Amino acid sequence: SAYGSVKAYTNFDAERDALNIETAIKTKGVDEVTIVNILTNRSNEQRQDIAFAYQRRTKKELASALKSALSGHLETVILGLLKTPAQYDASELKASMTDEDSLIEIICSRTNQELQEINRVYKEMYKTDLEKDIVSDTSGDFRKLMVALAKGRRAEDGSVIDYELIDQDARDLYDAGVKRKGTDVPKWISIMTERSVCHLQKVFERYKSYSPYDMLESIKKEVKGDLENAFLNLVQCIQNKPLYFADRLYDSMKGKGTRDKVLIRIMVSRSEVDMLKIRSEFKKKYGKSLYYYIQQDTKGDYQKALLYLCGGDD
Ligand SMILES: [Ca+2]
Ligand SMILES: [Ca+2]
Ligand SMILES: [Ca+2]
């Protein structure tokens, strides 16, 4: 929040913003520049106030009006920015249902409290439980892992550290995998879904005291396929959530064109949470800024919108 790139605008005036956006929408050809400039420089909560004031004045819902007025990747970004975080995450989950990397990315990186609100909003929008949908769309151990993660019931022992449990969990992960001939997948799932993220960072550290390979290397040796890929993503997300996002951003822009669904989703969803840490990890790893990469990979008003969500560079 302190680590978000998008901050609450000072001296906020919803009605001013709604008049200005209406004018922009009705400009011949559409004044996209103004729409992007405003909405990318307001908090999500402020955008809700703007939507409310817009409908009151015009008798049109802002999101509907913008669906009609905008298109292409610009439209995706702007409509995503208008959704509340829970609505946005719920709708991105639904869209990922199959895209296992994206389901992990969303589910691994939200708080318990965000996950409860996502579950509630998902049922409301889609009239089915998120967990029922996951069970439908997935199978085997990846289904078990996803179901467990989606419940959003990681332990929350403030950060009162339990050094004994850290050690026991680390030994248990080792005994369940690298120490023995097969792999006890339910034990890995249990530990990695039921403990807090800070606890698990310490477990993975302590783990190295017992295992000749770190957690990521152990995963590579112990499991295969979709489930291997899922655990690797999950462990990265736990060990360093900003670097995880930075790597997903870099990968979204590599080579020819862009995986715009991923890029958009990250820039919208992490804009008010940790985009400054993501930037910092990205620059540290890749040498140039996130801003520089977005700028080289996208164009037009869509690019401008994403560069505002990035927020600049250091
Ligand atoms: Ca235009
Ligand atoms: Ca083994
Ligand atoms: Ca590219």
Coordinates of C-alpha atoms and ligand atoms in Angstrom, one line a residue:
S1 CA 0.0 0.0 0.0
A2 CA 3.0 2.0 1.0
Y3 CA 4.5 -0.3 -1.6
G4 CA 1.8 0.4 -4.3
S5 CA 2.5 2.6 -7.3
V6 CA -1.1 3.9 -7.4
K7 CA -2.0 6.1 -4.5
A8 CA -5.2 7.9 -3.4
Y9 CA -5.4 11.2 -5.2
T10 CA -5.3 14.2 -2.8
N11 CA -8.2 16.7 -2.9
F12 CA -10.3 14.1 -4.6
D13 CA -13.5 15.2 -6.3
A14 CA -15.7 12.5 -7.8
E15 CA -18.1 14.7 -9.5
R16 CA -15.2 16.7 -11.3
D17 CA -13.8 13.4 -12.5
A18 CA -17.2 12.2 -13.8
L19 CA -17.9 15.4 -15.8
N20 CA -14.5 15.3 -17.3
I21 CA -14.8 11.6 -18.2
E22 CA -18.2 12.1 -19.7
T23 CA -16.8 14.9 -21.8
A24 CA -14.0 12.6 -22.9
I25 CA -16.3 9.8 -23.8
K26 CA -18.5 12.1 -26.0
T27 CA -15.5 13.8 -27.8
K28 CA -15.6 12.8 -31.4
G29 CA -13.4 9.8 -31.8
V30 CA -13.1 9.5 -27.9
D31 CA -10.6 11.4 -25.8
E32 CA -8.8 8.3 -24.4
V33 CA -5.9 10.3 -23.1
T34 CA -8.1 12.0 -20.5
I35 CA -9.8 8.8 -19.5
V36 CA -6.5 7.0 -18.9
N37 CA -5.0 10.0 -17.2
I38 CA -7.8 10.2 -14.6
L39 CA -8.5 6.6 -13.9
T40 CA -4.8 5.6 -13.6
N41 CA -4.3 8.4 -11.1
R42 CA -7.1 7.4 -8.7
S43 CA -7.3 4.7 -6.1
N44 CA -9.7 1.8 -6.8
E45 CA -12.0 3.1 -4.0
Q46 CA -12.0 6.6 -5.8
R47 CA -12.9 5.0 -9.1
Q48 CA -15.9 3.5 -7.5
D49 CA -16.9 7.0 -6.3
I50 CA -16.4 8.3 -9.8
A51 CA -18.6 5.5 -11.3
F52 CA -21.3 6.3 -8.8
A53 CA -21.3 10.0 -9.7
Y54 CA -21.1 9.3 -13.4
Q55 CA -24.3 7.2 -13.4
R56 CA -26.2 9.8 -11.3
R57 CA -25.4 12.6 -13.7
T58 CA -25.8 10.6 -17.1
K59 CA -28.1 7.7 -16.3
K60 CA -25.5 5.3 -17.8
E61 CA -23.2 3.0 -15.8
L62 CA -19.6 4.1 -16.4
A63 CA -18.3 0.5 -17.0
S64 CA -21.1 0.0 -19.7
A65 CA -20.4 3.3 -21.3
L66 CA -16.7 2.6 -21.5
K67 CA -17.3 -0.9 -23.0
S68 CA -19.1 0.8 -25.8
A69 CA -16.6 3.7 -26.1
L70 CA -13.2 1.8 -25.8
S71 CA -11.8 -1.3 -27.5
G72 CA -8.8 -3.7 -27.5
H73 CA -6.2 -3.9 -24.8
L74 CA -7.0 -0.3 -23.6
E75 CA -10.6 -1.4 -22.9
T76 CA -9.4 -4.4 -21.0
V77 CA -7.1 -2.4 -18.7
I78 CA -9.7 0.3 -18.0
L79 CA -12.6 -2.1 -17.3
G80 CA -10.3 -4.1 -15.0
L81 CA -9.3 -1.0 -13.1
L82 CA -13.0 -0.2 -12.5
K83 CA -13.7 -3.6 -10.8
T84 CA -13.2 -3.9 -7.1
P85 CA -10.2 -6.2 -6.2
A86 CA -12.5 -9.1 -5.3
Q87 CA -14.6 -8.7 -8.4
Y88 CA -11.5 -8.4 -10.6
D89 CA -9.9 -11.5 -9.0
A90 CA -13.1 -13.5 -9.2
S91 CA -13.5 -12.6 -12.9
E92 CA -9.9 -13.5 -13.6
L93 CA -10.2 -16.8 -11.9
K94 CA -13.3 -17.6 -14.0
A95 CA -11.4 -16.6 -17.1
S96 CA -8.5 -18.9 -16.2
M97 CA -10.9 -21.7 -16.1
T98 CA -7.1 -24.8 -17.4
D99 CA -4.5 -21.9 -17.2
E100 CA -2.8 -23.4 -14.2
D101 CA -0.1 -20.8 -14.0
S102 CA -2.6 -18.0 -13.8
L103 CA -4.7 -19.8 -11.1
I104 CA -1.7 -20.2 -9.0
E105 CA -0.6 -16.6 -9.6
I106 CA -3.9 -15.3 -8.4
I107 CA -4.6 -17.7 -5.5
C108 CA -1.0 -17.8 -4.1
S109 CA -0.6 -14.1 -3.8
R110 CA -3.8 -12.9 -2.0
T111 CA -4.3 -12.7 1.7
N112 CA -6.7 -14.9 3.6
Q113 CA -9.1 -12.1 3.9
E114 CA -8.9 -11.3 0.2
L115 CA -9.6 -14.9 -0.6
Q116 CA -12.7 -15.0 1.6
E117 CA -14.0 -11.9 -0.2
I118 CA -13.1 -13.5 -3.6
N119 CA -15.0 -16.6 -2.7
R120 CA -18.1 -14.6 -1.7
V121 CA -18.0 -12.4 -4.8
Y122 CA -17.4 -15.4 -7.1
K123 CA -20.6 -17.2 -5.8
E124 CA -22.6 -14.0 -6.2
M125 CA -21.4 -13.2 -9.8
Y126 CA -21.4 -16.8 -11.0
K127 CA -24.0 -18.5 -8.7
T128 CA -21.6 -21.4 -8.2
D129 CA -18.9 -21.8 -5.6
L130 CA -15.4 -21.2 -6.7
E131 CA -14.3 -24.5 -5.2
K132 CA -17.0 -26.4 -7.3
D133 CA -15.6 -24.7 -10.4
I134 CA -12.0 -25.7 -9.5
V135 CA -13.1 -29.3 -8.9
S136 CA -14.7 -29.3 -12.3
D137 CA -11.8 -27.8 -14.2
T138 CA -8.9 -29.6 -12.6
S139 CA -7.8 -33.1 -11.5
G140 CA -5.5 -35.2 -9.5
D141 CA -3.0 -33.6 -7.1
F142 CA -3.2 -30.2 -8.8
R143 CA -6.9 -30.2 -8.0
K144 CA -6.1 -31.1 -4.3
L145 CA -3.5 -28.4 -4.1
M146 CA -5.8 -25.7 -5.8
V147 CA -8.8 -26.6 -3.6
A148 CA -6.7 -26.3 -0.5
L149 CA -5.2 -23.0 -1.6
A150 CA -8.6 -21.4 -2.7
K151 CA -10.1 -22.0 0.8
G152 CA -7.9 -19.2 2.1
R153 CA -7.4 -20.6 5.6
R154 CA -3.6 -20.4 6.1
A155 CA -2.8 -20.3 9.8
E156 CA -2.4 -16.8 11.2
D157 CA -0.2 -16.9 14.4
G158 CA 0.4 -13.2 14.0
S159 CA 4.1 -13.4 13.6
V160 CA 4.6 -15.3 16.8
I161 CA 7.4 -17.6 15.4
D162 CA 7.1 -21.3 16.3
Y163 CA 10.7 -22.5 15.9
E164 CA 9.8 -26.0 16.8
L165 CA 7.1 -26.2 14.1
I166 CA 9.5 -24.7 11.6
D167 CA 12.0 -27.4 12.2
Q168 CA 9.3 -30.2 12.3
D169 CA 7.8 -28.9 9.0
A170 CA 11.2 -28.8 7.4
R171 CA 12.0 -32.3 8.5
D172 CA 8.6 -33.5 7.4
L173 CA 9.0 -32.1 3.9
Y174 CA 12.4 -33.7 3.6
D175 CA 11.1 -37.1 5.0
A176 CA 8.1 -36.9 2.6
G177 CA 10.3 -36.4 -0.5
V178 CA 14.1 -36.3 -1.0
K179 CA 14.7 -38.7 1.9
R180 CA 12.4 -41.6 0.6
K181 CA 11.8 -43.5 -2.5
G182 CA 8.4 -42.2 -3.6
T183 CA 6.9 -38.8 -2.6
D184 CA 4.1 -38.2 0.0
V185 CA 2.3 -35.5 -1.9
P186 CA -0.5 -35.0 0.7
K187 CA 2.1 -34.2 3.3
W188 CA 3.6 -31.5 1.0
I189 CA 0.2 -30.1 0.2
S190 CA -0.8 -30.0 3.9
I191 CA 2.3 -28.1 5.0
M192 CA 2.4 -25.7 2.1
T193 CA -1.3 -24.8 2.3
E194 CA -2.0 -24.7 6.0
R195 CA 0.9 -22.7 7.4
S196 CA 1.4 -18.9 7.0
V197 CA 3.6 -17.5 4.2
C198 CA 6.2 -16.1 6.8
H199 CA 6.4 -19.5 8.6
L200 CA 6.9 -21.2 5.3
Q201 CA 9.7 -18.9 4.2
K202 CA 11.5 -20.0 7.4
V203 CA 10.6 -23.7 6.8
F204 CA 12.2 -23.5 3.3
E205 CA 15.3 -22.0 4.9
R206 CA 15.5 -24.6 7.6
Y207 CA 14.9 -27.3 5.0
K208 CA 18.2 -26.6 3.5
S209 CA 19.8 -27.7 6.8
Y210 CA 18.3 -31.2 6.2
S211 CA 18.3 -31.6 2.4
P212 CA 21.2 -31.5 0.0
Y213 CA 18.9 -29.6 -2.4
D214 CA 16.8 -26.5 -1.7
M215 CA 13.0 -26.7 -1.9
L216 CA 12.8 -25.7 -5.6
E217 CA 15.5 -28.3 -6.6
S218 CA 13.7 -30.9 -4.5
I219 CA 10.4 -30.3 -6.3
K220 CA 12.2 -30.8 -9.6
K221 CA 13.5 -34.2 -8.5
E222 CA 10.4 -35.4 -6.7
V223 CA 7.4 -34.6 -8.9
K224 CA 6.6 -34.1 -12.6
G225 CA 4.2 -32.4 -15.0
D226 CA 1.4 -30.0 -13.9
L227 CA 1.9 -30.7 -10.3
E228 CA 5.7 -30.0 -10.5
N229 CA 5.1 -26.7 -12.3
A230 CA 2.4 -25.8 -9.6
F231 CA 4.6 -26.4 -6.7
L232 CA 7.5 -24.5 -8.3
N233 CA 5.2 -21.5 -8.9
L234 CA 3.8 -21.8 -5.4
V235 CA 7.2 -21.9 -3.7
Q236 CA 8.5 -18.9 -5.7
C237 CA 5.4 -17.0 -4.7
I238 CA 6.0 -17.8 -1.1
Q239 CA 9.8 -17.2 -1.0
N240 CA 9.6 -13.9 -2.8
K241 CA 6.3 -12.7 -4.0
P242 CA 7.6 -9.5 -5.7
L243 CA 10.3 -11.4 -7.7
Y244 CA 7.7 -14.0 -8.6
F245 CA 5.6 -11.3 -10.2
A246 CA 8.7 -9.6 -11.7
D247 CA 9.6 -13.0 -13.5
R248 CA 6.0 -13.4 -14.7
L249 CA 6.1 -9.8 -16.1
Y250 CA 9.5 -10.5 -17.9
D251 CA 8.2 -13.7 -19.3
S252 CA 5.0 -12.0 -20.5
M253 CA 7.0 -9.6 -22.7
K254 CA 9.8 -12.0 -23.9
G255 CA 10.2 -12.4 -27.6
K256 CA 7.6 -11.6 -30.2
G257 CA 4.6 -9.7 -29.0
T258 CA 3.1 -9.9 -25.4
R259 CA 1.0 -12.2 -23.2
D260 CA -1.2 -9.2 -22.5
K261 CA -3.6 -11.1 -20.2
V262 CA -0.9 -11.7 -17.8
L263 CA 0.8 -8.3 -18.1
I264 CA -2.6 -6.5 -17.7
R265 CA -3.7 -8.6 -14.8
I266 CA -0.5 -8.1 -12.8
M267 CA -0.3 -4.3 -13.5
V268 CA -4.0 -3.8 -12.4
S269 CA -4.0 -6.3 -9.4
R270 CA -0.6 -5.3 -7.9
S271 CA -0.8 -1.5 -8.6
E272 CA -2.1 -0.8 -5.1
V273 CA -0.3 -3.6 -3.2
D274 CA 3.4 -4.1 -4.0
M275 CA 4.2 -2.7 -7.4
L276 CA 7.2 -0.8 -5.9
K277 CA 8.7 -4.1 -4.7
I278 CA 8.0 -5.8 -8.0
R279 CA 9.8 -2.9 -9.8
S280 CA 12.7 -3.1 -7.4
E281 CA 13.1 -6.9 -7.8
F282 CA 12.6 -6.6 -11.7
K283 CA 15.3 -3.9 -12.0
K284 CA 17.7 -5.9 -9.8
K285 CA 17.3 -9.0 -11.9
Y286 CA 16.9 -7.7 -15.4
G287 CA 19.0 -4.6 -15.3
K288 CA 16.5 -2.2 -16.9
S289 CA 13.3 -1.0 -15.4
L290 CA 9.8 -2.6 -15.7
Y291 CA 8.8 0.7 -17.2
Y292 CA 11.4 0.4 -19.9
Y293 CA 10.2 -3.1 -20.8
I294 CA 6.5 -2.1 -20.9
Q295 CA 7.3 0.8 -23.0
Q296 CA 9.2 -1.3 -25.6
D297 CA 6.5 -4.0 -25.6
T298 CA 3.3 -2.2 -25.9
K299 CA 2.0 0.9 -27.7
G300 CA -0.7 3.6 -27.9
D301 CA -3.0 4.6 -25.2
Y302 CA -2.8 1.0 -23.8
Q303 CA 0.9 1.5 -23.2
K304 CA 0.4 4.9 -21.6
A305 CA -2.2 3.3 -19.2
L306 CA 0.2 0.4 -18.2
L307 CA 3.1 2.9 -17.8
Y308 CA 1.0 5.0 -15.4
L309 CA 0.2 1.8 -13.4
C310 CA 3.9 1.1 -13.2
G311 CA 4.2 4.6 -11.9
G312 CA 7.7 5.5 -13.3
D313 CA 11.0 4.1 -12.5
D314 CA 14.0 4.6 -10.2
Ligands
CA1 CA -9.6 8.6 -29.8
CA2 CA 11.6 -39.3 -3.1
CA3 CA 7.7 -8.7 -26.6

